[PDB]
Amino acid sequence: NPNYCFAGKTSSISDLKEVPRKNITLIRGLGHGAFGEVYEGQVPLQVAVKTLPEVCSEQDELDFLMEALIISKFNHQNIVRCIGVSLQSLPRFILLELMAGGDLKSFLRETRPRPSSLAMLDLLHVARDIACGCQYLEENHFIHRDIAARNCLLTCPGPGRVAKIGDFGMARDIYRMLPVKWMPPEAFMEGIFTSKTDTWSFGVLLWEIFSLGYMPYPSKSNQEVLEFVTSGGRMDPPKNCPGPVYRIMTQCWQHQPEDRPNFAIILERIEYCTQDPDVINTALPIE
Numbered sequence: 510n511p512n513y514c515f516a517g518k519t520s521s522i523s524d525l526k527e528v529p530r531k532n533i534t535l536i537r538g539l540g541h542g543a544f545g546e547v548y549e550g551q552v553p554l555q556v557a558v559k560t561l562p563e564v565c566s567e568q569d570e571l572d573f574l575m576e577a578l579i580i581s582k583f584n585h586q587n588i589v590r591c592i593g594v595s596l597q598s599l600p601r602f603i604l605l606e607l608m609a610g611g612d613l614k615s616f617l618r619e620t621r622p623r624p625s626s627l628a629m630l631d632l633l634h635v636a637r638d639i640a641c642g643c644q645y646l647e648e649n650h651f652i653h654r655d656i657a658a659r660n661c662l663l664t665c666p667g668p669g670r671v672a673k674i675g676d677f678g679m680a681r682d683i684y685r686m687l688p689v690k691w692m693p694p695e696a697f698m699e700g701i702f703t704s705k706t707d708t709w710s711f712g713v714l715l716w717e718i719f720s721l722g723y724m725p726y727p728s729k730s731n732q733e734v735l736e737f738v739t740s741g742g743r744m745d746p747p748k749n750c751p752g753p754v755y756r757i758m759t760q761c762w763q764h765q766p767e768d769r770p771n772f773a774i775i776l777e778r779i780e781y782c783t784q785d786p787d788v789i790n791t792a793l794p795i796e
């Protein structure tokens with residue numbers, strides 16, 4: 510059985526909480542993300558059920574086990590909880606906290622203001638939530654490598670929503686298709702990853718958030734983005750984006766890793782934005 514170390518402590522599949530398969534009922538599909546299908550389920554505790562296809566390479570199965578160990582070891586309010594696993598029956602399950610708000614990218618898309626609602630403060634709270642998750646990862650020396658709106662989840666649609674990081678598939682692969690639009694130069698050029706990798710990606714997530722769910726670098730392909738960013742190019746501000754928010758982005762995208770803020774600083778600047786009336790009184794565009 511494969512080992513895993515986080516915050517020092519070592520763990521193995523033996524440490525995962527096995528839930529009796531009989532206690533698990535599937536309700537409906539939620540979609541699949543390359544790894545396999547995910548269902549809403551119950552154990553009554555509401556869960557999202559990540560499944561391993563019974564037809565898979567042993568490498569797929571190892572990846573699956575590792576993902577289980579990674580998420581079970583985190584303990585933070587802005588990282589999705591693992592209720593447990595069911596590995597002793599096929600297909601194998603990983604059981605996650607059900608985030609009723611769905612993923613962040615689709616939420617932003619479906620909830621953007623129209624003549625038929627969202628405010629700057631809602632976007633800032635999401636940004637703060639994920640920054641807090643990233644800060645917890647940073648201080649535990651875990652590099653996520655794929656911070657992006659599609660990998661974040663919301664507890665609910667309404668104002669009290671809490672955003673959390675919900676997928677760790679990229680980190681799992683590296684621990685043992687590239688998200689180039691979320692990657693800093695040293696990452697996609699040299700394959701160098703550090704805490705400052707996630708800072709760059711967070712800047713891109715911020716853009717995704719305040720653009721309300723647009724794809725980064727609109728109209729550019731991966732290679733054009735690679736060349737654009739390598740030559741010092743950066744995204745323009747999203748529509749109606751307050752200058753203080755855009756400036757967090759541009760600081761996250763500093764070419765030198767050492768010139769980019771750590772997450773404690775990012776959280777400070779996000780806080781300041783939420784206090785600033787000229788920021789939060791700015792109306793979002795209505796499509």
Ligand SMILES: Cc1n[nH]cc1-c1cnc(N)c(O[C@H](C)c2cc(F)ccc2-n2nccn2)c1
Nearest residue numbers: 539540547557605606607608611612660675676
């Ligand atoms: C309800 C609901 N509607 N739409 C999504 C959910 C949902 C709630 N809670 C979860 N724990 C959850 O987890 C999966 C693994 C996930 C995690 C992530 F970060 C990004 C995407 C996905 N995803 N979306 C569909 C298939 N895979 C999904």
